[PDB]
Amino acid sequence: MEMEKEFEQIDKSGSWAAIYQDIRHEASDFPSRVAKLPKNKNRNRYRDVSPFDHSRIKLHQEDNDYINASLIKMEEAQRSYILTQGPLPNTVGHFWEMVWEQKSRGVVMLNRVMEKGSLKCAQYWPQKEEKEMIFEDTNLKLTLISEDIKSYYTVRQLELENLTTQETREILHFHYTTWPDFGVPESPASFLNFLFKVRESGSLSPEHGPVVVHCSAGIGRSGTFCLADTCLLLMDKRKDPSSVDIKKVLLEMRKFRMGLIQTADQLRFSYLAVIEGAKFIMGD
């Protein structure tokens, strides 16, 4: 069923809450035993958000291999994403270790460091060229190279150096800065513009490791980003773009990380973004 029509039918009926709870009821339940070990309590931002054991990212060290991050692998779309929480004071070094080990080109950030008067994430990147960061726990150095500040997002060029081997790589930081403290944006225009800038960069392409995507918990805004990308890619690839079922794509992605899309408003926003993006890409 053409999603634009399904959309107006849910809107006129006002059944967004009922659709959203049907998804919550049908979603996969897999074990998260590593996340709940007592040695990992200070590696988790929220007690109710854990990566499944089968899909979790492992750090390459014998000590403790645990990070709150999951590999979302979309077989038909031929896209992979790592979804992770906003790093904590004790996990900044683990975060950059994962970026290095997985060969990611891009980091996508969908939150501000402070929102609603509370800290949503650590200040994990350098704000001035001449004041670099050193993560001694993981033996990495991070330097700000350049910064391009626009109305809805900022793009930063970073240099990450493995101090062990003296290898360096360029990492692009895509920071969406205007998601509101409450609710979702009114128009998906600036979010779609942002997604097309990440795509243009090569960060989402198969010649690199998976893009690292985060918000505060790594399931809400982060969920919206990968559901919209994968849905628009499937509409490009298939003979009938109207066969793409956004609820079925979301349940497939929820096999790999729990809780993706946190509210009925985020579900409605995801529909709006896909419906609108399907147009501009090929003038519909």
Ligand X SMILES: Cc1ccc(CC(=O)NC[C@@H]2CCCO2)cc1
Query: Sign of the C-alpha dihedral, residues 60, 66, 67, 72?
Result: positive
Cα distance from N-terminal residue to C-terminal residue, the chain: 17
Site for ligand X in 192-251 (CB under 6 A): none
Site string for ligand X, 78-107 (x = CB under 6 A): -----------x--x---------------
Check binding of 11 to ligand X (CB under 6 A). no
Site string for ligand X, 104-133 (x = CB under 6 A): ------------------xxx-------xx
Report the nearest approach of ligand X to the CB of residue 136 (Å): 7
Among 66, 81, 135, 179, interactor with ligand X by CB under 6 A: 135
DSSP secondary structure letter of residue 209: B
Class of residue 29 by CB neighbours under 10 A (exposed 0-12, middle 13-18, buried 19+): exposed
Residue 262 counted as an annotated binding residue = yes
Report the nearest approach of ligand X to the CB of residue 131 (Å): 7
Binding-site residue positions for substrate: 181, 215-221, 262
Instruction: Give the binding site for ligand X (CB under 6 A).
Output: 89, 92, 122-124, 132-135
Q: Annotated active-site positions, please? A: 215
